[PDB]
Design an enzyme around this catalytic site. Structure first.
Site, PDB file in Angstrom:
ATOM      1  N   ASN A  73     -42.573  77.199  30.657  1.00  0.00           N
ATOM      2  CA  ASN A  73     -42.617  76.144  29.622  1.00  0.00           C
ATOM      3  C   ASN A  73     -43.796  76.552  28.736  1.00  0.00           C
ATOM      4  OD1 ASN A  73     -43.458  73.798  28.053  1.00  0.00           O
ATOM      5  ND2 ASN A  73     -42.076  72.566  29.283  1.00  0.00           N
ATOM      6  N   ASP A 118     -44.658  75.160  25.790  1.00  0.00           N
ATOM      7  CA  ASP A 118     -45.218  73.995  25.051  1.00  0.00           C
ATOM      8  C   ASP A 118     -45.679  74.435  23.662  1.00  0.00           C
ATOM      9  OD1 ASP A 118     -45.740  71.366  24.563  1.00  0.00           O
ATOM     10  OD2 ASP A 118     -46.846  71.031  26.391  1.00  0.00           O
ATOM     11  N   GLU A 177     -39.342  74.110  26.002  1.00  0.00           N
ATOM     12  CA  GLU A 177     -40.202  73.360  25.085  1.00  0.00           C
ATOM     13  C   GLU A 177     -40.743  74.287  23.998  1.00  0.00           C
ATOM     14  OE1 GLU A 177     -43.080  70.848  27.053  1.00  0.00           O
ATOM     15  OE2 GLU A 177     -43.366  69.612  25.272  1.00  0.00           O
ATOM     16  N   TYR A 209     -34.663  72.347  30.188  1.00  0.00           N
ATOM     17  CA  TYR A 209     -35.835  71.550  29.867  1.00  0.00           C
ATOM     18  C   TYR A 209     -35.392  70.100  30.026  1.00  0.00           C
ATOM     19  CZ  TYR A 209     -39.717  69.543  27.283  1.00  0.00           C
ATOM     20  OH  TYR A 209     -40.789  68.793  26.853  1.00  0.00           O
ATOM     21  N   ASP A 240     -38.122  73.776  33.640  1.00  0.00           N
ATOM     22  CA  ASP A 240     -38.988  72.617  33.774  1.00  0.00           C
ATOM     23  C   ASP A 240     -38.075  71.443  34.077  1.00  0.00           C
ATOM     24  OD1 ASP A 240     -41.337  70.937  31.506  1.00  0.00           O
ATOM     25  OD2 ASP A 240     -40.791  70.520  33.602  1.00  0.00           O
ATOM     26  N   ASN A 251     -39.137  68.581  35.244  1.00  0.00           N
ATOM     27  CA  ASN A 251     -39.902  67.366  34.964  1.00  0.00           C
ATOM     28  C   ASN A 251     -39.818  66.370  36.120  1.00  0.00           C
ATOM     29  OD1 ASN A 251     -41.565  66.960  32.562  1.00  0.00           O
ATOM     30  ND2 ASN A 251     -39.758  67.567  31.390  1.00  0.00           N
ATOM     31  N   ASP A 291     -41.864  73.066  37.711  1.00  0.00           N
ATOM     32  CA  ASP A 291     -41.061  74.205  37.310  1.00  0.00           C
ATOM     33  C   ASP A 291     -40.529  74.902  38.553  1.00  0.00           C
ATOM     34  OD1 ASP A 291     -41.711  74.297  34.236  1.00  0.00           O
ATOM     35  OD2 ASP A 291     -43.635  74.012  35.271  1.00  0.00           O
ATOM     36  N   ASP A 308     -49.808  74.298  28.916  1.00  0.00           N
ATOM     37  CA  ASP A 308     -50.221  73.462  30.037  1.00  0.00           C
ATOM     38  C   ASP A 308     -49.325  73.631  31.258  1.00  0.00           C
ATOM     39  OD1 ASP A 308     -49.100  70.320  28.542  1.00  0.00           O
ATOM     40  OD2 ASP A 308     -48.224  72.350  28.593  1.00  0.00           O
ATOM     41  N   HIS A 309     -48.275  74.453  31.175  1.00  0.00           N
ATOM     42  CA  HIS A 309     -47.605  74.998  32.353  1.00  0.00           C
ATOM     43  C   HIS A 309     -47.933  76.475  32.496  1.00  0.00           C
ATOM     44  CE1 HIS A 309     -44.319  71.728  32.274  1.00  0.00           C
ATOM     45  NE2 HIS A 309     -45.031  71.562  31.173  1.00  0.00           N
TER      46      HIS A 309
END
Length: 273
Positions: A26, A28, A54, A126, A165, A167, A238, A263-264
């Site tokens: 991911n 981001d 993402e 995602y 991801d 989530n 993930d 941030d992943h």
């Protein structure tokens, strides 16, 4: 409470050498991730297949440095029509997939790519976040059901690798603060239940936990805020999920905690196919 990923096991339990390396990340923000050297790490990691989630970048704005990965020359992208600046996923592959499709059947959020290869089908996803204050949990619940159904009528054809991801931290060992997050996106009861249903219905195995059932403090995401990454206050969001038929091919399932840019962090799968 900090974590050190074990070394790479590149041999299957029957002893065959790993033939396939899949990396999921991911990012981001693909453009920001690229400016923070993500492609340099990928080139070092040198996967046969690279999945990205993402991306937050339309196809027209894809930076041309992506074409500078000739080892991952076949690239497929899925972006939402409505949303700008949110969602988006990508799949980059050394070899061309036999077939590539987008979405999960009733479309368009740009969350899922499906790549059929010779021995298996790769899905990258995602999964929609339930949201601050569980605002989109209702959407997330229906998406889980649709996704579960979609995946069922898929692994009936060939074995399945699902990465990306998702989530949700499945169990308590999958995050640092189980008890403080029981009503926060990613650890609600509805979300943990949906992951369990995902595993039961398809069925799929969680690669990392299969190999490391007792390992704590193994996360793939940390909030940018505070210094959660520095304090290993994070979540395992993930995953690589596999059909049972592929477990004898499973050499290892990695968490690349040290790789920066998001941030992943990346996760990497080794299979002996």
């Amino acid at each position: 409470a900090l974590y050190e990923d074990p070394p790479d096991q590149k041999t299957s339990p029957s002893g065959k050498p790993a033939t396939l390396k899949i990396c999921s990340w991911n990012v981001d923000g693909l453009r920001a991730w690229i400016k923070k050297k993500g492609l340099d790490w990928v080139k070092e990691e040198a996967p046969d297949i690279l999945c990205l989630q993402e991306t937050k970048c339309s196809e027209n704005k894809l930076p041309a440095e992506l074409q500078e990965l000739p080892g991952l020359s076949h690239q497929y992208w899925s972006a939402p029509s409505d949303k700008e600046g949110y969602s988006g996923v990508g799949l980059l592959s050394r070899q061309a997939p036999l077939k590539v499709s987008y979405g999960i059947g009733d479309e368009q959020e740009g969350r899922v790519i499906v790549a059929e290869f010779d021995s298996f089908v790769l899905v990258t996803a995602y999964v929609p976040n339930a949201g601050r204050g569980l605002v989109r949990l209702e959407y997330r619940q229906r998406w889980d059901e649709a996704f579960r159904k979609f995946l069922k009528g898929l692994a009936s054809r060939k074995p399945l690798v699902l990465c990306g991801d998702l989530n949700v931290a499945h169990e308590e060992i999958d995050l640092r603060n189980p008890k403080g997050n029981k009503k926060n996106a990613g650890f609600t009861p509805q979300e943990r239940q949906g992951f369990g249903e995902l595993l039961q219905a398809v069925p799929l195995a969680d690669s990392f936990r299969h190999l490391y059932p007792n390992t704590p403090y193994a996360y793939t995401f940390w909030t940018y805020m505070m210094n959660a990454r520095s304090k290993n206050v994070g979540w395992r969001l993930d995953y690589f999920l596999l059909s049972h038929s592929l477990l004898p091919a499973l050499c290892d399932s990695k968490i690349r905690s040290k790789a920066l840019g998001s941030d992943h962090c990346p996760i990497t799968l080794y299979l002996a196919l």
